[PDB]
């Protein structure tokens, strides 16, 4: 009875989103991924120095 | 040349190493039973025999073997997840009741027990871990239509759902007033033990 | 030549032994399931017959090519008692993996409770002990005596091949009276049939004659050296035959290989 | 409550024997590394044995090795220090010290009370035996070492102990960066692998006990001479 | 009737979310330059533990991790140097999640027994003492995460998570908008909300102080095992049991670009992106990892070392190293 209501009301609310363009994440995405590429040292690989691991 | 504090931090670490060890050592003699079955078939009087809202670890001992039965019967979720938690135990007891054909609880209950001990005996992590089929509450019980030939008949039925040349299967028959529940068991788990050591060995 | 391509031979024996057990020994250690108290066994087998390769298969070569050792006889005792050693350490190796297999089947709870690595450990230091003092206590020719011959074949060959042989006939009517049916039935008579056959054929020929001429006229021609490098060939085969047919060891084997 | 109380405060005659036997119930004795650091009727403070989590790692001052012989048992949590053939010089308090080493750990959180008892080698100055300071200022105390502290791990080795008038002593920081439990956040500690200073801000007047600093990068552990503070 | 407006609702915010998907990560992206093939060796191997593992988690140092195995044991390893610093016993074995605090002094597990067992490491007594119990829950407690030194969020098998409160024990608040079954959730790194996985195939996006799923992600076909924000906290990339790894968007509401490849056909069960996020590794129900470019959807450097399935992975705060724990009881530490 109310698991109903309570499942459209929850809809309702998801529905309401500003819902920004796919592009603008996706240039978000890249920038925040190329702004912070130098300080990965998964991405690029780094000396035997700063390596706490040898 | 490790500093004075760092040896001292090592020498903890492998002080905890020792204490681990032993630990893992005291927690492999004992074996692990899973107890599993249908809606309340006679889990609870056989559980009674033996001896939260998750799991219940029976914890006892039977002729210096240490049983650690887990019966898990407070789990709502889907069997699936936490079905490979227990893929290292020794045996897993399957309860059934045969007063199970008359009760409905659409399909009646020998079905959905013997459905699901299909599933469980075909799961892929259960594959080498036998089964003890406790064909419980037979006094309720009662081709020929009598009790003896109709429970081998069942016995067979329920049997015949592995297709594993190194998975057995052991059934025994109780009136649920018995105290031969413990026996049982502990003959299947030597059993056990025997085929495992067997395939050990390279010997099948 | 002819010598050489023996030594060859012996080489390609050297590089099998050297291979394979070490193949045990990083296949015991490195898997988790694998690390069984009873396991310890074989390691200890395996790390004594890689031992006996790079310890006596050279100088064994430098014998029966030239007429007598090539340095002085304190080298050759000390050579001879070592070679002695570890055969014996491989043979009762043998003995301990077939006793611990028995009460591993028969009365397999009180054994599982009494099976830590702690007596596993014990035992390999007992049989190592008991190699040692059948081994130590008496050109390079063989030890040939009237009473320490005839004592270190019986107690080094012919009881453990006793008791092996007693302890897979019983194992293998214990798996017959237990027991897709044909088929499991054909495997593991098979690989009772390849243990218990690959070491009599191994080492039964060379003590069966070290014995009679112990005590006998009967001296082999030349074939006497075949023997003997059956003999070695038995340490060749150990990390195969003890081990191929354990899954968990396949699965190691291959893993680490390919 | 966690508290370690000793036992034998009692006269021992010149070249003679006894036995100190401390016990502490707060914590975990087992998994503890214990110590014992000395005293005089002067300001000297000096490192006497070590025994560790295990029992199986024991350490001496360098100066009285093979006199003093240390022990502990779990069942009692009571550590044991055997003294043989006492002099004049080894008159003292004797301190007991807990200390657990683990990455993050502070060793010498805590020093019980002690029986007064009456009858190379990294070396730690402080220049600056007395600071006489009023309350309200920030004051600075110095200490130096002999050799480099700084270890290739990337840690400094020194502690930094306060001593309350006439209490057991409390450690103030430790590995020169990092606070003890409960010391007030105004303590501060910093330095070089050489040269370490203290700036404490807003002196109060209960931060007037005497200060010692101790190297650790060895267990031939020494302590530095006190710098007293004073009211003047 | 409530079922049909349901069922509009759902039509209109897919047609919503249809209606902006211009693009679709991989028509963009072709002029930045592929990642070259990372070649990732075992630094370090923590071969402690006795039985599988499910669980670990990197503190704020990035020097140590906590691992709970099937022996009943949490241990706190030390990870540049392999040292156990703390083997906490539990009371129940059968435990399935960790979770070290951002501080260093708090611990939490509990898989199999409703509860999120914590644990004080900065304790007087100085051994490690269980601090608090939380019992709410009527299933297994699939995974735990600490906010601040106190309040938690755990997710259970009965399909709720919790926010539970350390102090005081009890629900602070709950979240029950779920429909089927949770196994992992992953908090912001500012933890004002945080997502939670399925059993259903979708992922929710709760708010941490007004309990409530603000978006739902359903896109995804068959299971979820794991979750990982982005950095920054904007795109959350999925587990599968289905080999489909898949990161969504906070502000899009929607998938982004699904990472699949047909060579393998396994169940992921742990995911963690990079520091930087380039890279997005996941631990495969396939006996090893792998690394995904994050915006190629391309793939790159395998790392298998492994004997059992990789339960947990995670990329350290700072970034530095990648540790993966696997049924074989051996965590490995890939630099
Ligand atoms: C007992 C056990 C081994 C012996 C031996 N060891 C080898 C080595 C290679 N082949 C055959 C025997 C040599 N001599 C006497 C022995 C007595």
Redesign the interface.
Same mark, same amino acid.
């Given at each position: 009875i109310a698991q109903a209501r309570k499942l459209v009301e929850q809809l309702k609310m998801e529905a309401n989103i500003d819902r920004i363009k796919v592009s603008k994440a996706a240039a978000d995405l890249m920038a925040y991924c190329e702004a912070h590429a130098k300080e990965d040292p998964l991405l690029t690989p780094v000396p035997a120095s700063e390596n706490p691991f040898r | 040349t490790l500093?004075?504090?760092?040896?001292?931090?090592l020498?903890?670490?492998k002080?905890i190493e020792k204490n681990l060890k032993e630990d893992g050592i005291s927690a492999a003699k004992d074996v692990k039973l899973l107890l599993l079955g249908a809606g309340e078939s006679g889990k609870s009087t056989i559980v009674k025999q033996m001896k939260t809202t998750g799991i219940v670890e029976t914890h006892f001992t039977f002729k210096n073997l240490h049983f650690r039965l887990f019966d898990v019967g407070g789990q709502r979720s889907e069997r699936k997840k936490w079905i490979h938690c227990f893929e290292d135990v020794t045996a897993i007891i399957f309860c059934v009741a045969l007063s199970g054909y008359d009760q409905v609880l659409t399909t009646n209950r020998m079905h959905e027990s013997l459905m699901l001990f299909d599933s469980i005996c075909n799961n892929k992590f259960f594959i080498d871990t036998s089964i003890i089929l406790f064909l419980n509450k037979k006094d309720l019980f009662g081709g020929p239509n009598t009790y003896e030939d109709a429970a081998a008949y069942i016995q067979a039925q329920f049997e015949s759902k592995n297709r594993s040349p190194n998975k057995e299967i052991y059934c025994h028959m109780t009136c649920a007033t018995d105290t031969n529940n413990i026996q049982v068991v502990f003959d299947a788990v030597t059993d056990i033990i025997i085929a495992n050591n067997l395939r050990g060995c390279g010997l099948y | 030549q002819v010598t050489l391509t023996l030594v060859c031979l012996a080489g390609l024996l050297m590089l099998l032994t050297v291979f394979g057990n070490v193949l045990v020994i990083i296949a015991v250690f490195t898997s988790r399931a694998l690390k069984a108290p009873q396991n310890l066994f074989l390691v200890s087998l395996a790390s004594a017959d890689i031992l006996v390769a790079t310890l006596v298969i050279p100088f064994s070569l430098a014998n029966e090519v030239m007429g007598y050792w090539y340095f002085g006889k304190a080298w050759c005792e000390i050579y001879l008692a070592l070679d002695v050693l570890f055969c014996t350490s491989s043979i009762v190796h043998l003995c301990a993996i077939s006793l611990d297999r028995y009460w591993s089947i028969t009365q397999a709870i009180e054994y599982n409770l009494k099976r830590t690595p702690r007596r596993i450990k014990a035992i390999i230091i007992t049989v190592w002990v008991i190699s040692a003092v059948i081994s130590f206590p008496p050109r390079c020719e063989i030890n040939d005596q009237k009473w320490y011959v005839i004592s270190s074949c019986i107690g080094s060959f012919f009881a453990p091949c006793l008791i092996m042989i007693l302890v897979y006939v019983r194992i293998y009517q214990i798996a017959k009276r237990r027991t897709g049916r044909q088929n499991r039935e054909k495997r593991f008579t098979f690989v009772l049939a390849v243990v218990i056959g690959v070491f009599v054929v191994c080492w039964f020929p060379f003590f069966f004659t070290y014995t009679l001429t112990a005590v006998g006229c009967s001296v082999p021609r030349t074939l006497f050296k075949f023997f003997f490098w059956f003999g070695y060939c038995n340490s060749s085969l150990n990390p195969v035959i003890y081990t191929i047919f354990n899954h968990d060891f396949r699965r190691a084997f291959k893993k680490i290989l390919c | 409550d966690?508290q370690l109380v000793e036992s034998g405060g009692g006269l021992v005659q010149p070249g003679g024997s006894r036995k100190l036997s401390c016990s502490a119930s /707060?914590?975990?004795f087992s998994?503890?590394?214990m110590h014992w650091v000395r005293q005089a009727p002067e300001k000297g403070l000096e490192w006497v044995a070590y025994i560790?989590? /295990?029992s /199986?790692?024991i350490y001496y001052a360098d100066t009285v090795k093979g006199r003093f012989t240390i022990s502990r048992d779990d069942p009692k949590n009571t550590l044991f220090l055997q003294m043989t053939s006492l002099r004049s010089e080894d008159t003292a308090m004797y301190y007991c010290v807990?200390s657990?080493?683990?990455? /993050?750990?502070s060793?010498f959180?805590?020093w019980g009370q002690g029986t007064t008892l009456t009858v190379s080698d990294i070396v730690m100055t402080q220049a600056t035996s007395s600071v006489p300071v009023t309350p309200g200022e920030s004051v600075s105390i110095s200490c130096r070492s002999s050799k480099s502290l700084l270890?290739s791990?990337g840690?400094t080795?020194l502690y930094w102990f306060l001593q309350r008038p006439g209490q057991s002593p409390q450690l103030l920081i430790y590995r020169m960066s990092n606070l003890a439990?409960g010391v007030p956040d105004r303590f501060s500690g910093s330095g070089s692998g050489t040269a370490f200073t203290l700036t404490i801000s807003r002196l109060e007047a209960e931060d007037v006990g005497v200060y010692y600093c101790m190297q650790?990068?060895?267990?031939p552990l020494t302590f530095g001479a006190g710098t007293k503070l004073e009211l003047k | 009737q409530l079922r049909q407006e349901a069922e509009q609702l759902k039509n209109q915010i897919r047609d919503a979310r249809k209606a902006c998907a211009d693009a679709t990560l991989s028509q963009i992206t072709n002029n930045i330059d592929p990642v070259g093939r990372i070649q990732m060796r075992t630094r370090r191997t923590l071969r402690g533990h006795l039985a599988k593992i499910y669980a670990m988690h990197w503190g704020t140092?990035s020097?140590?991790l906590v691992s709970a195995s099937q022996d009943g044991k949490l241990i706190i390893w030390?990870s540049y140097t392999t040292?156990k610093?703390?083997a906490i016993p539990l009371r129940s074995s059968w435990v399935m999640t960790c979770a070290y605090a951002p501080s260093?002094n708090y611990v939490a597990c509990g898989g199999l027994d409703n509860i999120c067992s914590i644990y004080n490491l900065?304790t007087?007594?100085?051994?490690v003492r269980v601090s608090r119990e939380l019992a709410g829950h009527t299933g297994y407690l699939s995974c735990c995460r600490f906010l601040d030194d106190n309040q938690i969020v755990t997710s259970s098998g009965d399909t709720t998570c919790a926010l539970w409160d350390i102090e005081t024990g009890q629900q602070t608040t709950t979240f029950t908008g779920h429909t089927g079954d949770v196994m992992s959730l992953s908090l912001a790194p500012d933890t004002r909300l945080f997502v939670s996985g399925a059993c259903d195939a979708s992922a929710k996006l709760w708010d941490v102080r007004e309990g409530m799923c603000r978006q739902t992600f359903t896109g995804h076909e068959s299971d979820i095992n794991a979750i990982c924000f982005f950095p920054n906290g904007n795109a959350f990339a999925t587990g599968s049991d289905d080999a489909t790894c898949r990161l969504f968007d906070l502000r899009a509401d929607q998938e982004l670009m699904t990472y699949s490849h047909d060579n393998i056909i396994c169940g992921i069960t742990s995911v963690s992106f990079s520091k930087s996020g380039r890279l997005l590794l996941a631990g495969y129900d396939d006996f090893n990892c792998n690394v995904w470019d994050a915006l190629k959807a391309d793939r790159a450097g395998v790392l298998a070392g492994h004997d059992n399935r990789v339960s947990c992975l995670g990329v350290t705060d700072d970034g530095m190293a990648v540790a993966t724990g696997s049924w074989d009881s051996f965590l490995k530490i890939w630099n």
């Amino acid at each position: 009875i109310a698991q109903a209501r309570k499942l459209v009301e929850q809809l309702k609310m998801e529905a309401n989103i500003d819902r920004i363009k796919v592009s603008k994440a996706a240039a978000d995405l890249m920038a925040y991924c190329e702004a912070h590429a130098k300080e990965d040292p998964l991405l690029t690989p780094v000396p035997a120095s700063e390596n706490p691991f040898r | 040349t490790l500093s004075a504090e760092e040896r001292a931090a090592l020498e903890r670490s492998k002080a905890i190493e020792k204490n681990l060890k032993e630990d893992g050592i005291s927690a492999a003699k004992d074996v692990k039973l899973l107890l599993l079955g249908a809606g309340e078939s006679g889990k609870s009087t056989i559980v009674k025999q033996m001896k939260t809202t998750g799991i219940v670890e029976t914890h006892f001992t039977f002729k210096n073997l240490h049983f650690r039965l887990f019966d898990v019967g407070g789990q709502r979720s889907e069997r699936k997840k936490w079905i490979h938690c227990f893929e290292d135990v020794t045996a897993i007891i399957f309860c059934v009741a045969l007063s199970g054909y008359d009760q409905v609880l659409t399909t009646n209950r020998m079905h959905e027990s013997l459905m699901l001990f299909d599933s469980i005996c075909n799961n892929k992590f259960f594959i080498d871990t036998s089964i003890i089929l406790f064909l419980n509450k037979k006094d309720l019980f009662g081709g020929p239509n009598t009790y003896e030939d109709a429970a081998a008949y069942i016995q067979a039925q329920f049997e015949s759902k592995n297709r594993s040349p190194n998975k057995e299967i052991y059934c025994h028959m109780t009136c649920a007033t018995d105290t031969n529940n413990i026996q049982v068991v502990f003959d299947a788990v030597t059993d056990i033990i025997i085929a495992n050591n067997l395939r050990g060995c390279g010997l099948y | 030549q002819v010598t050489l391509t023996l030594v060859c031979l012996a080489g390609l024996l050297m590089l099998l032994t050297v291979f394979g057990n070490v193949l045990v020994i990083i296949a015991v250690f490195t898997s988790r399931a694998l690390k069984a108290p009873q396991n310890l066994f074989l390691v200890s087998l395996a790390s004594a017959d890689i031992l006996v390769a790079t310890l006596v298969i050279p100088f064994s070569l430098a014998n029966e090519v030239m007429g007598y050792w090539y340095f002085g006889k304190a080298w050759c005792e000390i050579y001879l008692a070592l070679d002695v050693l570890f055969c014996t350490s491989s043979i009762v190796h043998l003995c301990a993996i077939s006793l611990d297999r028995y009460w591993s089947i028969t009365q397999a709870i009180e054994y599982n409770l009494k099976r830590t690595p702690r007596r596993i450990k014990a035992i390999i230091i007992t049989v190592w002990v008991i190699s040692a003092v059948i081994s130590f206590p008496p050109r390079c020719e063989i030890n040939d005596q009237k009473w320490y011959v005839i004592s270190s074949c019986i107690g080094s060959f012919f009881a453990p091949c006793l008791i092996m042989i007693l302890v897979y006939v019983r194992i293998y009517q214990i798996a017959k009276r237990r027991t897709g049916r044909q088929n499991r039935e054909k495997r593991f008579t098979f690989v009772l049939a390849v243990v218990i056959g690959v070491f009599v054929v191994c080492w039964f020929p060379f003590f069966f004659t070290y014995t009679l001429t112990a005590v006998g006229c009967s001296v082999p021609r030349t074939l006497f050296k075949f023997f003997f490098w059956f003999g070695y060939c038995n340490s060749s085969l150990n990390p195969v035959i003890y081990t191929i047919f354990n899954h968990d060891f396949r699965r190691a084997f291959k893993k680490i290989l390919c | 409550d966690v508290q370690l109380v000793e036992s034998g405060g009692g006269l021992v005659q010149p070249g003679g024997s006894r036995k100190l036997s401390c016990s502490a119930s /707060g914590f975990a004795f087992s998994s503890f590394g214990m110590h014992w650091v000395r005293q005089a009727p002067e300001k000297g403070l000096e490192w006497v044995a070590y025994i560790s989590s /295990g029992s /199986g790692t024991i350490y001496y001052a360098d100066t009285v090795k093979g006199r003093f012989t240390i022990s502990r048992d779990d069942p009692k949590n009571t550590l044991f220090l055997q003294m043989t053939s006492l002099r004049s010089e080894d008159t003292a308090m004797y301190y007991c010290v807990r200390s657990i080493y683990y990455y /993050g750990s502070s060793p010498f959180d805590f020093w019980g009370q002690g029986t007064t008892l009456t009858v190379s080698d990294i070396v730690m100055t402080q220049a600056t035996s007395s600071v006489p300071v009023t309350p309200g200022e920030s004051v600075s105390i110095s200490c130096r070492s002999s050799k480099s502290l700084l270890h290739s791990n990337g840690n400094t080795y020194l502690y930094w102990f306060l001593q309350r008038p006439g209490q057991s002593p409390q450690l103030l920081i430790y590995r020169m960066s990092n606070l003890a439990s409960g010391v007030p956040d105004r303590f501060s500690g910093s330095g070089s692998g050489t040269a370490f200073t203290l700036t404490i801000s807003r002196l109060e007047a209960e931060d007037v006990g005497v200060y010692y600093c101790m190297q650790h990068l060895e267990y031939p552990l020494t302590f530095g001479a006190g710098t007293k503070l004073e009211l003047k | 009737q409530l079922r049909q407006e349901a069922e509009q609702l759902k039509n209109q915010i897919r047609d919503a979310r249809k209606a902006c998907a211009d693009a679709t990560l991989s028509q963009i992206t072709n002029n930045i330059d592929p990642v070259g093939r990372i070649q990732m060796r075992t630094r370090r191997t923590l071969r402690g533990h006795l039985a599988k593992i499910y669980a670990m988690h990197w503190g704020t140092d990035s020097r140590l991790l906590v691992s709970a195995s099937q022996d009943g044991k949490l241990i706190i390893w030390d990870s540049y140097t392999t040292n156990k610093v703390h083997a906490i016993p539990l009371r129940s074995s059968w435990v399935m999640t960790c979770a070290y605090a951002p501080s260093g002094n708090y611990v939490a597990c509990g898989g199999l027994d409703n509860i999120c067992s914590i644990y004080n490491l900065k304790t007087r007594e100085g051994n490690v003492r269980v601090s608090r119990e939380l019992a709410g829950h009527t299933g297994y407690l699939s995974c735990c995460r600490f906010l601040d030194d106190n309040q938690i969020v755990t997710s259970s098998g009965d399909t709720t998570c919790a926010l539970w409160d350390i102090e005081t024990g009890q629900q602070t608040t709950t979240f029950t908008g779920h429909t089927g079954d949770v196994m992992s959730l992953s908090l912001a790194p500012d933890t004002r909300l945080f997502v939670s996985g399925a059993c259903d195939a979708s992922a929710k996006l709760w708010d941490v102080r007004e309990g409530m799923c603000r978006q739902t992600f359903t896109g995804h076909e068959s299971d979820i095992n794991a979750i990982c924000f982005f950095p920054n906290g904007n795109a959350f990339a999925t587990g599968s049991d289905d080999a489909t790894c898949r990161l969504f968007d906070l502000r899009a509401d929607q998938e982004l670009m699904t990472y699949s490849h047909d060579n393998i056909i396994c169940g992921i069960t742990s995911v963690s992106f990079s520091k930087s996020g380039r890279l997005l590794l996941a631990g495969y129900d396939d006996f090893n990892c792998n690394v995904w470019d994050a915006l190629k959807a391309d793939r790159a450097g395998v790392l298998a070392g492994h004997d059992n399935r990789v339960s947990c992975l995670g990329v350290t705060d700072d970034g530095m190293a990648v540790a993966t724990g696997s049924w074989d009881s051996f965590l490995k530490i890939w630099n």
